[PDB]
Amino acid sequence: IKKPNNNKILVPKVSGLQYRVFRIHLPDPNKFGFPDTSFYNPDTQRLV
Amino acid sequence: YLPPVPVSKVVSTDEYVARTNIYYHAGTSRLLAVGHPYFPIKKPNNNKILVPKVSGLQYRVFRIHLPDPNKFGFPDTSFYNPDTQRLVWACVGVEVGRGQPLGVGISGHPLLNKLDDTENASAYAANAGVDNRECISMDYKQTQLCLIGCKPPIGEHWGKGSPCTNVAVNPGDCPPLELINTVIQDGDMVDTGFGAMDFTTLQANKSEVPLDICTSICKYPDYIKMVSEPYGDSLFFYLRREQMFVRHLFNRAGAVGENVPDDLYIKGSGSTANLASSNYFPTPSGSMVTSDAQIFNKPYWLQRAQGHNNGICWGNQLFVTVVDTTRSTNMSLCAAISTSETTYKNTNFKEYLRHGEEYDLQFIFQLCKITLTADVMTYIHSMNSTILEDWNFGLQPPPGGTLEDTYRFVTSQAIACQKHTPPAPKEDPLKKYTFWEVNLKEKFSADLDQFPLGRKFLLQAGLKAKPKFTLGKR
Amino acid sequence: VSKVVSTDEYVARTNIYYHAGTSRLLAVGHPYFPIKKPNNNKILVPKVSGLQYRVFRIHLPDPNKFGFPDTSFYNPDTQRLVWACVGVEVGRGQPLGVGISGHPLLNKLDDTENASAYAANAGVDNRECISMDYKQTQLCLIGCKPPIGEHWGKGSPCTNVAVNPGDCPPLELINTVIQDGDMVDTGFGAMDFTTLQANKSEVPLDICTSICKYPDYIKMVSEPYGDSLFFYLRREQMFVRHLFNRAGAVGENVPDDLYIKGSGSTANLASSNYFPTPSGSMVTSDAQIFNKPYWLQRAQGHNNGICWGNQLFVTVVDTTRSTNMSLCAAISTSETTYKNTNFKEYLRHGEEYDLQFIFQLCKITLTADVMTYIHSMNSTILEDWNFGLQPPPGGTLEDTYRFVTSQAIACQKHTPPAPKEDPLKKYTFWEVNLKEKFSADLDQFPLGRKFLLQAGLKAKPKF
Amino acid sequence: YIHSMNSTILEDWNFGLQPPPGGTLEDTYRFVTSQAIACQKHTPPAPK
């Protein structure tokens, strides 16, 4: 749905027939704080 | 239980806090500000602001935050269960960079209340006509100062009071005055040395002061009051420099509010039967600036402070405000409306007034923990209950049952948006106030040597563990 | 935030088991609408159909009042006793058959499945008498907190654009407690037609006024203690049948670029709106979820079958028995020539439920954490127990007697206000009392011995 | 092997120039705006 003169959408077109993509970010675990992190070195390695 | 009670032992922070062994740096480079010194520009019909009024005469607040102490990464954390111990950042050291060349600005008013110049006068004054007010500017008091703490700054200023009703309310009477303490907001006008008060309300003439200070309310911070904080958490440190001197000698022009009792002099005659305005006011003048006048651009180191707070940022929260008079020089330029004619036209060129601004934040930080006991924690409760919230204390009591919690679904919805467009739960108690913000939470580094400042921090206390590249001799 | 734990931590399981159960629950009523005296507001017949939801509230007497053959195994001071719900049954005796519903005026244009020519032009009030079958469904709900449903609904629009009559109202997602008598989805989705459908003819009678709702397993299971439901099962199915059109003024025209302009008969766009005809499928004896024992061991929530406040909930809904028997009475028995004027027609509907509940007995020790932890969870629970004190007051009172003696001492006693116990008293729904029916032996009951058989260890006297 | 697989991966780590030194060593961060006046910070395109 959009305003008849306008090009701007009034309502988004939605139906279950539409595909759905989901993008999910994670924060870099190499910035994180595990209750114990000493099990690794942040120099020679990283975490994924 | 033991100890958040009755007594007065007025806990000093550094006992319950423990200092970790690890440090960090983060920061933005810099910022800008430009603008017109005298007045802002908004769309004349609309309320939308095209250009603001900007000067070094504007106090600049600074508020930044750091993320959850319990979500953020350490090479060695073994020392804690975050449920056994809460955590906080600690502020060891701070730096104020200022990058623009140094020069003096100025401001004034096209109609200023003036009688005449009695600095040197060979003759008695004249009679006042209709609007003798003049166009004059003045050099503002040379100043630098610094304010940093975990709680917002507090200034003080005069304001018109509410006179007890005995004597009449009669117009022309002297309005009442009283002291006013208030939170300092960004964009406020720095007092020129004319006193912290409201020129708008208290001075009806409105021509008494230059445009910059004409409308608004200048304030000055009360250290006493602030340092009177028995926590000290207002600000845990500061320094200032200010200097000024006299330039010219003036007089007010207007009706005499309260006349001089004649017993103070001998009755004149002719011109001397009349009495010239008894009201003098000086012309304040800023002085020479020196390369020493910069108090900035040098690393500060704060170990112990007046309050009990030692550099602790509560609610993940930190405050800064600074004043520079040294860069006050405003850049001016013109726009030629007619680009053709070769003969000068005063009408041809539209002048403009702008100013530069530049800052730096390079922040040391230290890490700290809290052994978690209502033995203390309730004193935190006692101290401030706002930290009861974002912190969950790993518990409400040592058993610590959850809230039968609120988890909401709002994340995206049906075009309703009173599920908030309006403000969300909690609050900023300062939200009504207006002042500056930046997010630094992306700027941390697990290694120090990366940056210019830190090695001074290093070279300051030196280095125990000294980074080795196994390069050079083996 | 110190994070709720598994109830099987502090609770201890006892060695004793009990049973009680109702005689039965049957029903009679009219499926389509309730019956009332025409002038009066009082109901002559309550509206009843299988499509109506059913809620079951079951009290238990406080076991700490219930003397055991040997009571010595616990201290009533330091502890309490709480019932645990091991296993559950749902009896259904009706012969299995499908009901049905319709409406005499149904918004419709024409048949869209096959059209040999373009339709006619919309007149005034083309609604028709048409009926359909609702989706087949079976589900079961068990827990100590009321079942939480959800539905669509009208919310307050933004205030920017002025709403003209006939505008699209915004939509809202709304939870509420589930009330008995409420209606299953027909495949029209949970919402209030009454608000969002002015036509009132867009659906068959039964659901027209009410608000169909549906359980949201997420938010339900989202509970930290799971006490909404610790267990459930569900079965449902549907398929398409007919394809129709809404008949009425087009709310929003289709952008032309999505088609090519016609002419003549093709100049006018036929109604864009379609709605499906939902159709129940073949029922089977197999997929019946009832008349079979259940055995609870684990529950998604940390609550394991613990019924707080002597309180236990059952929500059961099925369409399988929806059969509506039709009957006819004769106003005049004389004439042998039949006349449709001679017979009045009536609709009544049967329902049949049954309940049999195992229960396990359970004790709780104390300490402070537990006390706290419960008092954290729901403090009202301790109220019905005897722990929480709460010192009593009182100094002095002046009785002045006597008052009807009309020499005036002040006017008087104002303190009824707290018989109030059920906070949900606003919520009406089906009620049953078991408190009398406990017994100490499974053996005498049909259901129980299975409990024995399952866990084995047939212990009985000698003869 | 990783750099073979997808090299852009190393970029987001601290990682990104050949055995361990560091850095993309031209100048990094800049911000020109505070209030609405003239060319906004978004007059240049978003580089990342």
**Secondary structure of chain B as H, E, C letters:** CCCCCCCCCCCCHHHCEEEEEEEEEECCCCCECCCECCCCEECCCCCCEEECECCCCECEEEEEECCCCCCECCCCCCCCCCCCEEEEEECCCEEEECCCCCCCCCEEEEEECCCCCCCCCCCCCCCCCCCCCEEEEECCCEEEEEEEECCCCEEEEEEECCCCCCCCCCCCCCCCEEEEEEECCCCCEECCCCCCCEHHHHCCCCCCCCHHHHCCECEEECHHHHHCCCCCCCCCEEEEEEECEEEEEEECCCCCCCCCCHHHCCCCCHHHHCCCCCCEEEEEECCCCCCCCCCCCCCCCCCCCCCCCCCECCCCEEEEEEEECCCCCEEEEEEECCCCCCCCCHHHEEEEEEECCECEEEEEEEEEEEECCHHHHHHHHHHCCCHHHHCCCCCCCCCCCCCCCCCCCCCCCCCCCCCCCCCCCCCCCCCCCCCCCCCCCCCCECCCCCCHHHHHHHHHHCCCCCCCCCCCCC
Nearest to A33 among B73, B78, B415 (CB): B73
Nearest to A33 among B74, B78, B81 (CB): B74
Local structure of A31: helix, strand or coil: helix
For residue C369, which residues of chain B lie inside 8 Å, CB to CB?
Answer: 398-399
For residue B396, which residues of chain C lie inside 8 Å, CB to CB?
Answer: 1-2, 376
Note whether C56 and C400 are within 8 A (CB).
Answer: no
Return residues 26-45 of B near D (CB < 8 Å).
28-35
The encoded tokens of residue C12 equal: 């201890």
Local structure of C218: helix, strand or coil: helix
Note whether B395 and B18 are within 8 A (CB).
Answer: no
The encoded tokens of residue B375 equal: 């033995």
Scan for tokens 């991966």, then name that residue: D9
D12 to chain A, any CB pair closer than 8 A? The answer is yes
Smallest CA–CA distance from B405 into chain C, residue: C224
Count the neighbouring beta carbons within 10 Å of the beta carbon of residue C95: 9
How was this structure determined? It was done by cryo-EM
Note whether C103 and C129 are within 8 A (CB).
Answer: yes
The encoded tokens of residue B196 equal: 């912290």
Smallest CA–CA distance from C153 into chain B, residue: B414
Note whether C315 and C309 are within 8 A (CB).
Answer: no
- SS3 of chain C: helix, strand, coil, percent, to 5: 10, 30, 60
Note whether B362 and B30 are within 8 A (CB).
Answer: no
The encoded tokens of residue B307 equal: 């309050």
The encoded tokens of residue B408 equal: 């909401």
Going by beta carbons, is chain B in contact with chain A, meaning 3 or more pairs sit under 8 Å apart? yes
Question: What is the Cα–Cα distance from B16 to B2, expressed in whole angstroms?
Answer: 13
Note whether C90 and C353 are within 8 A (CB).
Answer: yes
Q: Which helix or strand (DSSP H or E) is residue C131 part of?
A: strand C128-132
Pairing of strands B317-324, B220-221: unpaired
For residue B75, which residues of chain A lie inside 8 Å, CB to CB?
Answer: 37-38, 41-42
For residue B457, CA distances in Å to B312, B363, B452 come to 18, 11, 9
What are residue B49's phi and psi, to 5 degrees? -95, 115
Nearest to B71 among A30, A33, A37 (CB): A33
Question: What is the Cα–Cα distance from C307 to C364, expressed in whole angstroms?
Answer: 13
Note whether B250 and B118 are within 8 A (CB).
Answer: yes
Q: Which of B187, B139, B145, B179 is nearest to B159 (CA)?
A: B179
Local structure of C424: helix, strand or coil: helix
Tally helices (H) and strands (E) across chain D: 2, 0
Could you tell me which chains touch chain B, where touching means 3 or more CB pairs under 8 A?
Answer: A, C, D
Question: What is the Cα–Cα distance from B284 to B192, expressed in whole angstroms?
Answer: 8
B414 to chain C, any CB pair closer than 8 A? The answer is yes
For residue B81, which residues of chain A lie inside 8 Å, CB to CB?
Answer: 35
Note whether B302 and B320 are within 8 A (CB).
Answer: no
Count the neighbouring beta carbons within 10 Å of the beta carbon of residue C86: 19
Give the gyration radius of chain D's Cα atoms. Answer: 16
Pairing of strands C431-433, C54-59: parallel
